[PDB]
Design a protein around this ligand. Sequence first.
Ligand code: HEM
Ligand code: HEM
Ligand code: HEM
Lengths: 251, 251, 251
Amino acid sequence: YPVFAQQNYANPREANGRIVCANCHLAQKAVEIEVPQAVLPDTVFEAVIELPYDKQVKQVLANGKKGDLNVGMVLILPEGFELAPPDRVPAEIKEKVGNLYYQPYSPEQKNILVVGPVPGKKYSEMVVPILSPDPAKNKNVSYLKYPIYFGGNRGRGQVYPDGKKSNNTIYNASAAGKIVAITALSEKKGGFEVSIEKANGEVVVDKIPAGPDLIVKEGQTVQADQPLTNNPNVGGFGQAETEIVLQNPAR
Amino acid sequence: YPVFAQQNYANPREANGRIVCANCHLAQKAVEIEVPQAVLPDTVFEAVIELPYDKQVKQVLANGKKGDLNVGMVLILPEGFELAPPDRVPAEIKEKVGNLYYQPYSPEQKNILVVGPVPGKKYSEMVVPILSPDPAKNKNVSYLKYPIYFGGNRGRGQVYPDGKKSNNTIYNASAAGKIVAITALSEKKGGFEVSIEKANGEVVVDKIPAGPDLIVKEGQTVQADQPLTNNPNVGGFGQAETEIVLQNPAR
Amino acid sequence: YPVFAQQNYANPREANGRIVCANCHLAQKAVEIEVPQAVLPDTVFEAVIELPYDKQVKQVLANGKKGDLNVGMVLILPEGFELAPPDRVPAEIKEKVGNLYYQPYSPEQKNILVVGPVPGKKYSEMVVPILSPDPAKNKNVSYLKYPIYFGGNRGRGQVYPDGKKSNNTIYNASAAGKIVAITALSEKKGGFEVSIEKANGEVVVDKIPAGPDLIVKEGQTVQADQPLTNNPNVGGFGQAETEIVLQNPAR
Ligand code: HEM
Ligand code: HEM
Ligand code: HEM
């Protein structure tokens, strides 16, 4: 979740421009963002983001069951830009925003906003109220064309903060050998146990949680790291970059 | 504690199933819950929950020493279901339950119960006396197969409501540089103070409470937010789910 | 803006005499400046500048729309000359000067004045109240014929300090190929996305902000750097040079 990024990465955007969500949300899926080409200083504007996907397709949940997807994002704005205060957000805009609670990536990064998890059904499109800075009061900001970086995700990740794989990813053979057995993990607790008899005769047992479907058969020989299941993931992460000009007014 | 969730989260369960304890109890540790396949209306059934862990493995305590772990949990029951009143719990069951005090998440949420902190050595397994609602009198409940969500934790968390870290977690360098000095935080209580000479001459001192162990030496160089200690945490949070059929008496 | 020059160029005039505004305001447009041929020591005189342009012609704004042009300038006076303080400017002149706030290029360069952005509608002609030095006190100056350099602009520039293009300039193809598609960058705010399929099947997408007009069509084949739009710029930067004699009054 955005909280996983926050708790494990001080900067959500890596040197090459990759947003850290990608370190765990391994599938790529297009997203979009639009902001006005230009805005006056100390003015509230809207950032409209889209995280499209097929609402009819459900995902594997942590409990192994199928369910709806949820969305989240991280928006990296120029230094000085901030989430617009509620007292600066017009009712018409609060209406478009809805019941969302944008938060700064950290108290020391008010220019980086996150939100989520929130229902994909209702928030595949979101509006972010942003307050532009004033170069006349903030020496760290100028009347320039500034880049804006966006990262948007839908669906559960493939790996956890501890490095363990979630049940929403591909599982591969720990060793090469003949599959001598495939046992159902339980009755309520789905999953499987794949026994691989190595060339030396030792048997290893690979545990596979419920979620992914097996693509291997008993008696089948597999190579080490060969996929033993398909990929159950139906979600993905996408990035988009845009820009905005902080106008320099004067009459 | 379960109270932290109560004081900070209105709903302990998020849309995808994640239970809020996960926000501060970063370690994942399986748990189990079992209830009868079905139950008649207005009847007391027992929910048996387990929070297994090696009782021989001591955890880091707040004072810096190693000691026993406590357990806690949040149980999400369908509306209408509540803790069975004492006058409805048979002597036999009260004896199994023990001196546990299950409390509603809030006065308006009797269908959500919590317990803890309580000694894991004595409560690694618990019995919760539940009273099934009566569709005949409660129109908000019907004869359906109802889900039951459980979240159980053992061991101290890694972060508090305000973001501060406990001493039962990993401490990382607050800045990149070379460790020019490592001093004891407390002469007698342990803990450390690692002085890091930044790449700009400026020296910073990172305080490390007693509890975790240092994995860096004097003169060593470290990167921004690089592990200065191990991860002392031996506990964990886990979620389990189940279901029960609210039976309609024939005749 | 004049501030871009101030923040990026220590000296607004290069050795060859080109004024730094020209590094970003690529269209040359005549300007005029007049100062009397001579002035007495410690005397307030006027510099009358003209930044002519067709007031009926609107320019492209940063937001993509059309609007008025702002003007600004840099005035390089001989060492010792400065903006005449208010107490030394006759109401007659202050009235001509209007509500303009001439400022030194930097605190150390009182002899170099800048102003703007200000509306060209009202300030296409400006009056600058200058105080001549006195070789009797400022021995760094004498009774000579001194050069004066002027740089005046109107309209938005073509490139920012970081090299990014503004939307008030020509956009060219990033690579040679055939335009396989042209879509709106913004559904309601304009702008375009030109898809160029180059020889080896690869496709690149050039983003053109709202402002310039496309001079190309889908199905058309272009060459690298070939203009994809017109030049929306209707403003311009001009320089002028004059001189003034610091008189040595009979004694
Ligand atoms: C970082 C800014 C970031 C975003 C964006 C993000 C979003 C996100 C959402 C919306 C969910 C819920 C999806 C759903 O369909 O329910 C979610 C879930 C998981 N994430 Fe995530 N996530 C971001 C970053 C990261 C990082 C850096 C990690 C881990 C270190 C990570 C991992 C995961 C995992 C695992 C899940 C699934 C949780 C589960 O229910 O099993 N994410 N993320
Ligand atoms: C919510 C339902 C929830 C549970 C379950 C839970 C349990 C729990 C226990 C039983 C302890 C004590 C364990 C021990 O060995 O002493 C405990 C301790 C801490 N918790 Fe917790 N906790 C739940 C939720 C949360 C939340 C949301 C936070 C904070 C915002 C949180 C944090 C912590 C921390 C830190 C501790 C350590 C306290 C200390 O001894 O210093 N918990 N929790
Ligand atoms: C320096 C002495 C200098 C002057 C004079 C000048 C003036 C100027 C004005 C008055 C404007 C506003 C015009 C309008 O119609 O809105 C303006 C705008 C831009 N400038 Fe400029 N400018 C001078 C110098 C420079 C320099 C050296 C740069 C860049 C490093 C530069 C660039 C631009 C750009 C681009 C703009 C457009 C800003 C926008 O509205 O998007 N100028 N300048």
